[PDB]
Design a protein around this nucleic acid. Structure first.
Ligand SMILES: [Mg+2]
Ligand SMILES: [Mg+2]
Ligand SMILES: [Zn+2]
Length: 600
DNA sequence: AAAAAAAAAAAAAAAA
DNA sequence: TTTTTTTTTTTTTTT
DNA sequence: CGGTACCCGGGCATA
DNA sequence: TCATAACCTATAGATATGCCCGGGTACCG
RNA sequence: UCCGAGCCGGUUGUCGCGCGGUUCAAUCCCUGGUGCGGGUGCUAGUACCGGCUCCGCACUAUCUAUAGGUUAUGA
């Protein structure tokens, strides 16, 4: 089940107008922000430093010890022998790291609450980063060493004469991933390039499971692949390949959210003794700082507010906790037909880039939510110029652009990165101390809510108070193609669920290649009209653009004798919606998917 | 009269 | 789903 | 000039 | 190929309670 | 490196149409939404409904950090 939810509000309204408490909140998060930032660098610095002897077995204690050592130095006196071992081992490096970046031990008190949150949060990033991206980068490395992208040019395409190469590549990849045990005679059939890659992969000391493929092994214990993941990054840098962030770094200097709980409240905000705090109710202790009468703190879906918030000095995130907390193909419309038949109105939506949502219904009405509307309404495009403009006024672009790559794994190269970051750290700190930077992150959230809230309001007025949405399954989720821009594709499947609007998926195969007025794809043409390129930089280059969103049908039955064009023009997105309605009506009527739209 | 140059349409490719 | 690049052909001009 | 006792507060472990 | 901001998409986590000890205040021979 | 949305046309359910005309919407400040009432003015029509703004109450909205692709800027 779902046991949590969040309500985000502004710092001004969330807290009572008390500068003494408000200033303490800003000061505390600022100190915690520095510890989190330096802790990530220290963890990376320690790992690179120890690469000369052996890769350490990183654990939650490793991050926790670094956090304490950065703040308290040698004053940290843990009593668990497991942690105390890390203290002595990590002590030389933390002091070594501090002398390079010039960090001064804040010696903050009442740390354990913040340290625990950062310790777990930082360790969480290690799990996620290595859980899936390790497989992606490892497979990418195989493609890059063989220069597969270049192989398609050096070898004939679209022929069986070279299907062996890809069949060969699949066979090699299985051996590299240990998916299939190689035979003893297969080794002699390896060219020097193939043999070299095999040795390089063997140097990773990859874990292995005899029962299931490697992909399942990574999920079972992602941390076991951490030494391999760091080694893989070294190979990328050693051959000039586009480097990836092997170890996550909290690089951003913009004030980041810091979690504040009940314990942190009385220790740092109210600054009362623990003995006094425990004698008061949890809610009553918070009412002395936060304005719980605000709309943000109201309970929802049986989840009440318990003391816990994350703030960055501009916005406050209020978390609601369910009492049952742990305390330590169905999406496709093909199976949801019964619900659709009882829907008041059925809306078909075809996702695209310029027209993020293009909507149509059986009545024939149309509605779209273009990217330009989102950019103007959300203000991200408008904020971008101001964000870049501030750099020109303060001259910070000249500084950031020269920062050495943080993705590097060589200790000497990484040492330069820290030194260069320290060179202009003070100047950038003043620039990022401007409330504008955090204000935009908060204002962008308000505009984003308004733009998405107005989207539902327009759709409700356009199609009715209640309707069911059938959307295509196409999505560039985390796989945006080069050029173009990122667009919300799978996020709508969640947004509709937030508004309790039923959403179902539909296969788009051949939707954009059939004329609805004749139900035939035999007379559909593409990319006929030419014109100067719409993108101004491409236009200045003199390159030509062919219309992409315009499709016409040349079948005589669709034509009228008076037309000199010879085509019945259609909008690309409108064809898909009309075809979807035909598909939906066929399924709703009980005839299933039309043959013309069938893959078979 | 023969050899060479500007432009249109088709296609691949993206990536694990 | 959308752009870019190349290639092949196709059409035309120069000498 | 040294040695007990009560008690609070900081700090750390852990499910 | 590199640096900053972001938009989107995916993962994981979403606090609280008890006990050690050592030093302050008080006193006696 | 540039961009709002709707409508009448050139059009035929047509183009990121740097095609024309036309209606209202947003530039700073703001957590957004639905219903149930009470209380300020601001615009028609033949002494009275609707939209815009606050009050309070029922529930509705998951974010933070990291990473991958891309984008704008600076090299
Ligand atoms: Mg589609
Ligand atoms: Mg489309
Ligand atoms: Zn047709």
């Amino acid at each position: 089940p779902t046991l949590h939810t969040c309500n985000k509000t502004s710092f001004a309204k969330a807290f009572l107008p008390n500068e003494t408490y408000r200033q303490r909140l800003l000061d505390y998060i600022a100190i915690i922000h520095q510890l989190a930032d330096h802790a990530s660098h220290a963890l990376k610095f320690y790992i690179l430093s120890t690469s000369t002897s052996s890769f350490p077995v990183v654990h939650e204690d490793t991050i926790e010890a670094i956090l304490y050592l950065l703040n308290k130095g040698e004053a940290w006196h843990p009593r668990k022998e497991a942690k105390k071992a890390w203290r002595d081992c990590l002590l030389p490096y933390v002091q070594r790291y501090c002398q390079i970046v010039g960090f001064i031990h804040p010696n903050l008190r009442g740390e354990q609450q913040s340290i625990n949150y950062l310790t777990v949060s930082m360790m969480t990033n290690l799990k996620v980063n290595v859980q899936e991206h390790f497989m992606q980068m490892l497979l990418r490395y195989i493609n890059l060493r063989f220069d597969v992208k270049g192989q398609k040019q050096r070898l004939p395409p679209k022929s069986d004469a070279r299907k062996a190469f890809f069949t060969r590549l699949r066979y090699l990849k299985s051996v590299f991933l240990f998916d299939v045990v190689p035979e003893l005679e297969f080794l002699d059939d390896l060219t020097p390039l193939e043999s070299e890659v095999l040795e390089e992969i063997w140097s990773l000391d990859l874990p292995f499971l005899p029962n299931d493929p490697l992909a399942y092994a990574i999920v079972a214990d992602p941390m076991s692949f951490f030494p391999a993941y760091c080694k893989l990054s070294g190979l990328y840098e050693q051959y000039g390949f586009q480097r990836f962030s092997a170890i996550p770094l909290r690089r951003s200097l913009i004030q980041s959210h810091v979690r504040i709980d009940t314990i942190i409240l009385y220790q740092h905000i109210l600054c009362i003794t623990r003995r006094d705090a425990e004698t008061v109710e949890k809610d009553d202790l918070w009412m002395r700082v936060c304005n719980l009468c605000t709309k943000a703190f109201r309970s929802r879906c049986g989840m009440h507010f318990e003391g816990s918030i994350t703030t960055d000095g501009a916005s406050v995130s209020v978390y609601l906790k369910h009492p049952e907390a742990d305390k330590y193909k169905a999406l496709y419309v093909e199976n949801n037909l019964p619900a659709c038949r009882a829907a008041e109105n059925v809306v078909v939506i075809d996702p695209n880039k310029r027209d993020i949502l293009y909507c149509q219904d059986s009545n024939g009405t149309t509605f779209r939510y273009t990217a330009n509307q989102r950019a103007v309404e959300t203000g991200s495009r408008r904020f971008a110029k101001r964000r870049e403009a501030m750099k020109e006024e303060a001259g910070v672009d000249l500084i950031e652009s020269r920062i050495p790559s943080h993705k590097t794994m060589n200790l000497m190269d990484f040492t330069r990165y820290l030194l260069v970051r320290r060179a202009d750290w003070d100047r950038r700190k003043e620039f990022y101390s401007h409330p504008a930077h955090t204000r935009w992150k908060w204002h962008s959230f308000i505009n984003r809510q308004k733009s998405e809230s107005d989207l539902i309001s327009n759709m409700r007025n356009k199609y009715g108070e209640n309707f069911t949405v059938v959307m295509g399954d196409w999505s560039d989720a985390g796989r945006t193609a080069r050029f173009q821009t990122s667009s919300k594709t799978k996020g709508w499947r969640t947004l509709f669920k937030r508004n309790r609007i039923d959403c179902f998926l539909l296969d788009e195969y051949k939707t954009s290649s059939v004329c609805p007025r004749c139900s035939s794809s035999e007379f559909v043409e593409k990319k006929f009209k030419t014109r100067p390129h719409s993108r101004p930089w491409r236009r200045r280059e003199g390159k030509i653009e062919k219309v992409h969103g315009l499709l016409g049908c040349t079948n005589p039955n669709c034509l009228q004798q008076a037309w000199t064009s010879g085509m019945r023009y259609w909008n690309r997105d409108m064809l898909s919606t009309c075809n979807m309605l035909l598909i939906v009506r066929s399924m709703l009527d009980g005839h299933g998917r039309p043959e013309v739209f069938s893959r078979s």
